[PDB]
Design a protein around this ligand. Structure first.
Ligand code: NI
Lengths: 303, 323
């Protein structure tokens, strides 16, 4: 037993005693450290590398700070490397999630997108650089993802999500987590329910963002189905339904980087808490809504 | 006005703009407007309807004029290039949507290219702010830092990639920023901020905005008050984040003034961090800095500090001074 006062905090066990005089009282400080302030470095991981433990170090101290699940700090990092996350959009919120997940040591990224990089994507889509223009988005994403973290394995699917139940189970494949917005959404949710895969939603704009509920899909939780069934409101409703009278005028969606990174950050944090259990995740059954104008927020229960 | 959608409510009412936003709302429009507006990108139009009346068509066009909803094809930017207007397009749409300072959309972006932001420290909070600012078309970035990239910086400091290990942070930073946005000028100072005002006024230089963390800090603040330079504070951890207040330093708001050893032993005590907390913090900052510089929309954080738990998502404001 070797007292590692958790490298987060500023200020043999038999070794410190003998080195000190050079017993219950030191025994007293060591033990009372069981108030979750002490490490037992005596454990090394049989999965993670020398490089990885170094690279993942500063967040590993963070898992160990809360240690909700009572594990050695690498076990948490282990639960990320064992994870497989599928992302069904690869511009907007999609590249920021991919980015921050790869940086965090997520095991696998399954990326799905049928688009290609345009110069107008560069202001907000963080995985694509000026020289990536003209590439297919998923190819650029993987290229970029591995330059950041070479231990992340990336599976890329150059296609859109069609409402084909046979194709989606292939696209979902053996995922451990799913990230998506807002029938194809519904077919996936269903796939997710069948394979017991946690699913997190999200969506919004520069004025206000939300990071939708988590569905654990372990059983013992409500699941997607249960949720399935001048007014500032009516034009809200009409817009999400895409009914626009634009005609031959070409109108584009107004988006910029700040709003995406905020929800992408809320999303990645919540996903990391779920996978690892280093701390409890708020967003199970809740929707967090935050104005980016006046910073008022609110919660929504789904179950 | 290519920022605005023309929305069709179920009952048939129309709203020109996605998020009024002070978008015009036409209630119970004549049958003729849905085909009218639908053809207004390009006298001319009355032709196409060949049920509607000629004078009734001009008033409609008349109206859309004083409502500031109609496009100005005659305006070209002498500041922005062909490439920038492309790359900045969608955020340009976002400015055109709220349009608080009543300007042509290009003008707002111009106000960004003309800006110079100095960032003190390229740690976690530091790297994300530089990035999103560069992406957003900030004119010039002044990076101040004496460190070099470590393998442990790679999990949270986003401007640094694996091949960047061992390099100077400000130089690795500049290489990365320029891969993302070649239009941003980057001035780099491989040094830490000493509490010498003689150097600090040199490091600040002709900055137009300052970002720093929650001492040198107080001199930078004094330099800022003296030169009328906005300063935004920030800070927190993986558990709760805070951003602001912003100090306008215009003389019509209260100023910054108005408001040991460790028994460490042989263990190395480190900063506990992961990326998610930083992105939220830089995005709140960047949005607030962009709104302040350009004025396309009003910034909340002037004189206020916003605090958000990342555990249970309770937030709270703290006033630091009144406008
Ligand atoms: Ni395309």
């Amino acid at each position: 037993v070797k007292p590692l006062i958790k490298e987060s905090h500023h200020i043999v066990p038999r070794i410190f005693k003998e080195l000190v005089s050079e017993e219950h009282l030191e025994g007293l400080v060591a033990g009372l450290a069981e108030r979750k302030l002490l490490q037992d470095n005596s454990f090394f991981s049989k999965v993670l590398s020398g490089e990885e433990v170094e690279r993942y170090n500063r967040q590993i101290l963070q898992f160990s700070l809360i240690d909700a699940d009572n594990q050695h700090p690498f076990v948490y990092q282990e639960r990320l490397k064992q994870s497989k996350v599928a992302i069904f959009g690869m511009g907007g919120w999609g590249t920021w999630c991919a980015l921050q997940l790869a940086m965090s040591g997520i095991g696998t990224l399954r990326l799905i997108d049928g688009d290609d990089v345009e110069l107008s994507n560069i202001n907000r889509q963080v995985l694509y650089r000026t020289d990536d223009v003209g590439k297919n988005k998923v190819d650029a994403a993987k290229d970029t993802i591995l330059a950041y973290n070479e231990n992340v394995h990336v599976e890329t699917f150059f296609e859109f999500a069609s409402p084909d139940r046979a194709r989606l189970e292939e696209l979902v494949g053996d995922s451990t987590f799913i990230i998506l917005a807002w029938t194809a959404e519904e077919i996936i949710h269903s796939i997710a329910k069948d394979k017991a895969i946690p699913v997190i939603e999200l969506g919004g704009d520069p004025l206000e963002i939300s990071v939708g509920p988590i569905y654990l899909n372990d059983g013992v939780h409500s699941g997607f189905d249960e949720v399935k069934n001048s007014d500032i409101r009516k034009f809200q409703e009409a817009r999400l339904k895409h009914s626009f009278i634009d005609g031959d005028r070409k109108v584009n969606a107004w988006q910029s980087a700040p709003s995406l990174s905020i929800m992408a950050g809320i999303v990645t944090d919540q996903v990391v808490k779920t996978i690892t259990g280093y701390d409890k995740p708020h967003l199970v059954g809740k929707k967090f809504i935050l104005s980016l104008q006046d910073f008022r927020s609110r919660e929504e229960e789904i179950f």
